[PDB]
Structure 1
Amino acid sequence: MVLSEGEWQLVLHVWAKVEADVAGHGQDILIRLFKSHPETLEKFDRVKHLKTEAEMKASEDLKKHGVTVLTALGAILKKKGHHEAELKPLAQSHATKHKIPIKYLEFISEAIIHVLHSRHPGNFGADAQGAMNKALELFRKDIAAKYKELGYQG
């Protein structure tokens, strides 16, 4: 699948807003993920034991993870589809070290979309959301292909 330049512009335009507060958005997203799909919290050894949203908000490790996710994703989105190099080490660690099924990447995509909608309503109308969904689908499709090469496809 291929995004048009106009769809990339919509994606990179909200993303410039996200980057004003990387740590805050990373928290919101990972908390949304863990509340909506608690099975995902089990994958994170530093943070599995957290019981409430208040504990989550307080956690420095959760905040570090959030910043790590959003910084890596940002770097991918700014490639506008030319992201083969960036994807290789990410696919390898998530397939063979962490063991993250594709389904979980769908869940975090849903969390990203929810949080951008809440925090950026003026820059995240229907066409911008469509374009973000297309960019994240492209990311997932390319990761799934790499999982398969690596021997996992989960």
Structure 2
Amino acid sequence: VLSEGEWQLVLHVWAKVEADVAGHGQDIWIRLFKSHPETLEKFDRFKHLKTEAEMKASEDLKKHGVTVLTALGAILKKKGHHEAELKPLAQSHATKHKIPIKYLEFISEAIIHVLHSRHPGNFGADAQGAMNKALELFRKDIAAKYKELGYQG
């Protein structure tokens, strides 16, 4: 459970991210595919992308990034009361996409790195601490649902 102060640190930096959702979406995903290429195999629609240039030019990847960050944003804004939002997400990711928890840890790493680079003034040690805590909360609850749904993760 995060404190009200910790949530504020999270939503404060997120308000900046929302000024350019598409741009942040691309940076985060490209960072992920470059740092952990195996994740690219989960996308039968992006597995063909070879270079960072091709990725930055993909309109579909950009739209996916927006869809992803929008869903994450709605969750964070619930400040822990994200039960309703998580169920449908856990079902598709556990039964259809089959995304293991390890991959959620990898993207969490990408989110932090991108925020740290683009928003240094609003992403200090305390702010990163809160963001990490929020993402771990997300991962903890998703992994729980996974078990309930019959997927080890």
State the TM-score bracket (shorter-chain normalisation). Answer: over 0.9
Cα RMSD after superposing both structures:
0.4
Long gaps (5+) in structure 2: none
> 1:30-80: CA deviations, max 9, x gaps?
000000000001111211100000000000011011001100000000000
CA drift of 1:153 comes to 2.2
Counterparts of 1:45 and 1:127, CA distance in 2 = 38
Counterparts of 1:20 and 1:103, CA distance in 2 = 29
CA drift of 1:142 comes to 0.1
Structure 2 residue matching 1:51: 3-state secondary structure:
coil
Identity %: 99
Contact 1:145 1:153 in 2 (8 A): no
Structure 1 residue matching 2:87: 3-state secondary structure:
helix
Structure 1 residue matching 2:79: 3-state secondary structure:
coil
Structure 2 residue matching 1:100: 3-state secondary structure:
coil
Q: Which residue is 1:76 aligned to?
A: 75
> 1:11-33: CA deviations, max 9, x gaps?
00000000000000000000000
Task: Give the alignment of 1:49-128 within 5 angstroms.
Answer: 49-128=48-127
CA drift of 1:104 comes to 0.1
* Number of residue pairs aligned between Structure 1 and Structure 2: 153
Counterparts of 1:138 and 1:153, CA distance in 2 = 18
Counterparts of 1:68 and 1:44, CA distance in 2 = 15
Counterparts of 2:5 and 2:43, CA distance in 1 = 36
> 1:97-132: CA deviations, max 9, x gaps?
000000000000000000000000000000000000
TM-score (norm 2): 0.99
Structure 1 residue matching 2:127: 3-state secondary structure:
helix
Q: Which runs of 4+ in 1 moved over 3 A?
A: none
Contact 1:22 1:67 in 2 (8 A): yes
Contact 1:23 1:67 in 2 (8 A): yes
CA drift of 1:9 comes to 0.1
Q: Which residue is 1:136 aligned to?
A: 135
